[PDB]
Structure 1
Amino acid sequence: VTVFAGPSRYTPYVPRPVAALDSPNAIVRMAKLVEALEEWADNYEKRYTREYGGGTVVPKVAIGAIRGGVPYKIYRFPELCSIYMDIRLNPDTNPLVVQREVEAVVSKLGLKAEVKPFLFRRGYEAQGIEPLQNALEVAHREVVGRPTERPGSPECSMWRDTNPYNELGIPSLTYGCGGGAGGGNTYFLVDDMLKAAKVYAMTAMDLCNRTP
């Protein structure tokens, strides 16, 4: 998201006082856009929460980077300033819909901006997962002792490589020990790692002996 302003002025000529949204300094305007975008994000994750058999997807939003202009030439404030947003999608959300929502936040503030997508990947729920699901379930109850529980939302609402497999028709799930690093967990119990390796092996012995 690049917000435009201007005209550029050498610091001894900058007009003051001026309303934030009218500032010639694009950094100043962006700061106002950021709090509007944070509230939009607060409501986004709730509006687009969606439950699937494979888990509940809670799609979140973060502002991951900002810049404008360059640190080694600061005697003129920037005519532009960019923000970089990570916006997670549930499998059923079109990226263009999200872009218009953001274009609208900007429009409500009366700002001139460019909202440009530079990454798009689709999320998927597995189709025909039952054989792997079952093979794993059997192994899990043997090694861990109880039925499996429904996954925590953050671990359903990220990017993991189940997506490429699913996209290409290889039914796929994710499973391992410990809390996610995004959490952030910083360790594994050696005993749990051993448990997992056992589950992985058992899963293989079931599944790899079926005829396709």
Structure 2
Amino acid sequence: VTVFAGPSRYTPYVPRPVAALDSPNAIVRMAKLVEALEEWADNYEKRYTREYGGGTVVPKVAIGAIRGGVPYKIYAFPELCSIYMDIRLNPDTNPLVVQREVEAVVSKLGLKAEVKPFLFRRGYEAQGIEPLQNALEVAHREVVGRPTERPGSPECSMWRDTNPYNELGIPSLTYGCGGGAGGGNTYFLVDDMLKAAKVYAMTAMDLCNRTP
């Protein structure tokens, strides 16, 4: 998202006082936009929360980077400034819908901006997962001792390589020991690791002996 403003002036000529949204300094305008997008982000995750058989997706938004002007030439403020947004999608949301929502946040502030997607990947719920799900369930109950619990939303609402497998028609789930790094956790119990290896081996001995 790149906000435009200007015109740029050598610092001794900068016009003041100016209202933030009217600032010729794109950085100052972007600061207002950031606040409105944060408000949008709070509600976005609520509005696009969605339950699936495979987990509950809570798609979140973060502003992961900002840059405007260059540090080695700061005597004239910039006429444009850019932020880079990470917007998660539930599997049933078209990226364009989200682009429009962000464009609308810009428009309501009365700003001029360019809203450009530079990445789009789809998320997937596995289809026909049951044979792996079952082999895993049986293995898990044996090795770990209780039924599996549904995963927390964050672990259902991220990127994992189950997406490419499911996309390519290979039913795929994610499972392993430990709390999640993104969380974030910092160690594994060796014992848990061994339970994981046994669950994996048993899942294979079940599943790979079923006829496809």
Output the CA distance in 2 between the equivalents of 1:28 and 1:68. Answer: 10
Percent of pairs with identical residues: 100
> For 1:79-116, what per-residue CA distance to the aligned partner results, in whole angstroms no more than 9, with x for missing partners?
00000000000000000000000000000000000000
Output the CA distance in 2 between the equivalents of 1:181 and 1:5. Answer: 40
Which runs of structure 2 are paired with 1:19-58 in the superposition (5 Å)?
19-58=19-58
1:211, distance to aligned residue in structure 2 (A): 1.0
Secondary structure of the 1:43 match is: helix
> For 1:147-181, what per-residue CA distance to the aligned partner results, in whole angstroms no more than 9, with x for missing partners?
00000100000000000000000000000001110
Secondary structure of the 1:160 match is: coil
Secondary structure of the 2:86 match is: strand
1:210, distance to aligned residue in structure 2 (A): 1.0
Output the CA distance in 1 between the equivalents of 2:169 and 2:57. Answer: 21
Question: What TM-score results when the alignment is normalised by the length of structure 1?
Answer: 1.00
Output the CA distance in 1 between the equivalents of 2:198 and 2:74. Answer: 59
Output the CA distance in 2 between the equivalents of 1:172 and 1:87. Answer: 23
1:131, distance to aligned residue in structure 2 (A): 0.2
Secondary structure of the 2:155 match is: helix
In the alignment of these two chains, the number of paired residues is: 212
Q: What residue number does 1:125 align with?
A: 125
Which runs of structure 2 are paired with 1:36-185 in the superposition (5 Å)?
36-185=36-185
1:127, distance to aligned residue in structure 2 (A): 0.4
- Superposed CA RMSD: 0.3
Secondary structure of the 1:119 match is: coil
Secondary structure of the 2:116 match is: coil
Output the CA distance in 1 between the equivalents of 2:17 and 2:101. Answer: 32
Secondary structure of the 2:98 match is: helix
Output the CA distance in 2 between the equivalents of 1:165 and 1:203. Answer: 18
1:197, distance to aligned residue in structure 2 (A): 0.2
1:4, distance to aligned residue in structure 2 (A): 0.1
Question: What TM-score results when the alignment is normalised by the length of structure 2?
Answer: 1.00
Secondary structure of the 2:100 match is: helix
Output the CA distance in 2 between the equivalents of 1:68 and 1:101. Answer: 23
* Stretches (4+) displaced over 4 A: none
Output the CA distance in 1 between the equivalents of 2:27 and 2:65. Answer: 13
Output the CA distance in 2 between the equivalents of 1:209 and 1:172. Answer: 18
Output the CA distance in 2 between the equivalents of 1:4 and 1:211. Answer: 61
Secondary structure of the 1:86 match is: strand
Secondary structure of the 1:62 match is: strand
> For 1:28-48, what per-residue CA distance to the aligned partner results, in whole angstroms no more than 9, with x for missing partners?
000000000000000000000
